[PDB]
């Protein structure tokens, strides 16, 4: 009989049971969304949005809830650290419960459509054979999709009727769900401009409505009908799979490179912010300012926010994890419980030295202290014999400013070495590792996991699109060639 990999073909020419299996799939996906939300709420710790944000805790769908406006819980806490006295129906658990109920209702509808498959609606009135007017159905669906896209862009994300979307400062310090005005100029195509999202959705929804009306009206030509096989549902499947992996590539690139729709307060920093010294540059500019204004070094480093200092730390890099390093970043390096302050290194001569920061590629990196002019002045040698740049030989001390070690100066090499090795990773923090039994190895961010899953799905769906386009074009030779 059928091979195991062809069982689902039994609904190719059964529109009612195709609707039924679609409804079952939708029920499963909605139920997954609800159950995943409830899992993440059960395991989420909201007591420290600064040093333990959701992207340090392995939260995957919690950022997607927070992105569109759901920011309060029924547990009395807001995602921004405030107090929610009236979260309303649409809390995190409220959205979870709504998805569970939706899953159940879709399961019932799937049962009904499986039983009552033989609807005269699916019969062609001319010949009595089962058929689908796929151009007309596409017109209806495109019209509905355009209406929904326009409504989402004109009422939800603008704050006209909905709550808006999550918008933050460039350095991820003061983000919140805000209404967003559309940007109708060239800046509307700025990926990092939040105003591009409402403008895109309004314009694309209007275009989708107009094109849906066109596809409702105008029948396809015979040439293009036969060329694209518009009478076969597998042709629609191949083109749909093509569009879906195109979108998967787009969202994977957008999540990996960052955009206005992937905030760092929800998904974590990007690897390019570490590579290009984004937070390091901002921190050093904020320290250079108020030094020219006339503050000492002990202050104006205490003025630096711990959130920004935490952002400038390679352990929050999404490209420092592993394929089988599972779970939260907290399970990787502990829960961050305090910024120790900036570490300034000096030698016996008094010149200032800086630890060469670890690049993203390197699992391990040698500890190197470089002066202002780019000359290596100290290191932790691998060969502690005939060495010329060890911490002991150079006489390097370290002074901390702004954190829990503010004002303290360490001169013993055994501690200068460990603080330089920690400064290799960026800003130095203290981590509680006993709570989760962290193994001391870096994990990946939710944006990294999202990008990996969606790029893998995008390639597999490229193969699926190839297979189904092949099946559509070469249907008449699917069981073999004509032999004549």
């Amino acid at each position: 009989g059928l091979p195991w990999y062809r069982v689902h073909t039994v609904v190719i020419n059964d529109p009612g049971r195709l609707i039924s299996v679609h409804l079952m799939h939708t029920a499963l996906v909605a139920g997954w969304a609800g159950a995943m939300t409830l899992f993440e709420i059960a395991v989420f710790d909201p007591s420290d949005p600064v040093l333990n944000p959701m992207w340090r805790q392995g939260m995957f769908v919690l950022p997607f809830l927070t992105r569109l406006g759901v920011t309060q819980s029924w547990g009395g806490w807001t995602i921004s650290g405030e107090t929610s006295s009236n979260p309303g129906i649409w809390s995190y658990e409220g959205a979870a419960a709504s998805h569970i109920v939706l899953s159940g209702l879709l399961f019932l509808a799937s049962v009904w459509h499986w039983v009552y498959w033989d609807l005269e609606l699916f019969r062609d009135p001319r010949t009595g054979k089962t058929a689908l007017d796929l151009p007309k159905i596409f017109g209806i669906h495109l019209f509905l999709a355009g209406l929904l896209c326009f409504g989402f862009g004109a009422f939800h994300v603008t704050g006209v009727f909905g709550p808006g979307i999550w918008v933050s400062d460039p350095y991820g310090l003061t983000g919140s769900v805000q209404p967003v005005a559309p940007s109708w100029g060239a800046e509307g195509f700025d990926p990092y401009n939040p105003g591009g999202v409402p403008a895109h959705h309004i314009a694309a929804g209007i275009l989708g409505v107009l094109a849906g009306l066109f596809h409702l009206c105008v029948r396809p030509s015979i040439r293009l009908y036969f060329g694209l096989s518009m009478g076969s549902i597998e042709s629609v499947l191949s083109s749909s799979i093509a569009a879906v992996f195109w979108a998967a590539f787009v969202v994977a690139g957008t999540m990996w490179y960052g955009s206005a729709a992937t905030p760092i307060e929800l998904f974590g920093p990007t690897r390019y912010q570490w590579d290009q010294g984004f937070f390091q540059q901002e921190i050093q500019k904020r320290v250079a300012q108020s030094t020219s204004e006339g503050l000492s070094v002990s202050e104006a480093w205490a003025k630096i926010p711990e959130k920004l200092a935490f952002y400038d730390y390679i352990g929050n890099n999404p490209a420092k994890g592993g394929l089988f390093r599972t779970g939260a970043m907290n399970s990787g390096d502990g829960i961050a419980v305090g910024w120790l302050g900036h570490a300034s290194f000096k030698d016996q001569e008094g010149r200032e030295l800086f630890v060469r920061r670890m690049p993203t590629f390197f699992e391990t990196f040698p500890v190197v202290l470089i002066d202002k002019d780019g000359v290596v002045r100290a290191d932790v040698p691998f060969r502690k014999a005939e060495s010329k740049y060890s911490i002991e030989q150079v006489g390097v001390s370290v002074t901390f400013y702004g954190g829990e070690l503010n004002g303290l100066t360490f001169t013993d090499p055994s501690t200068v070495k460990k603080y330089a090795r920690k400064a290799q990773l960026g800003e130095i923090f203290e981590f509680d590792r006993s709570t989760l039994q962290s193994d001391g190895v870096f994990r990946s961010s939710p944006r990294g996991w999202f990008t990996f899953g969606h790029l893998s799905f995008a390639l597999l769906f490229f193969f699926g699109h190839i297979w189904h386009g092949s099946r559509t074009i070469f249907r008449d030779v699917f069981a073999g060639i004509d032999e004549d």
């Binding site: 020219s292 800086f354 060469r356 920061r357």
Partner: peptide, 27 residues
């Protein structure tokens, strides 16, 4: 305020910083 100093101070910690990679034809 001193962009040259903040440039020469971000450079030894990270040579790939965009401040170092930007407008350095003048250097």
């Amino acid at each position: 305020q001193r962009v040259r100093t903040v440039l020469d101070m971000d450079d030894p910690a990270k040579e790939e910083t965009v401040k170092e990679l930007r407008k350095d034809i003048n250097n």
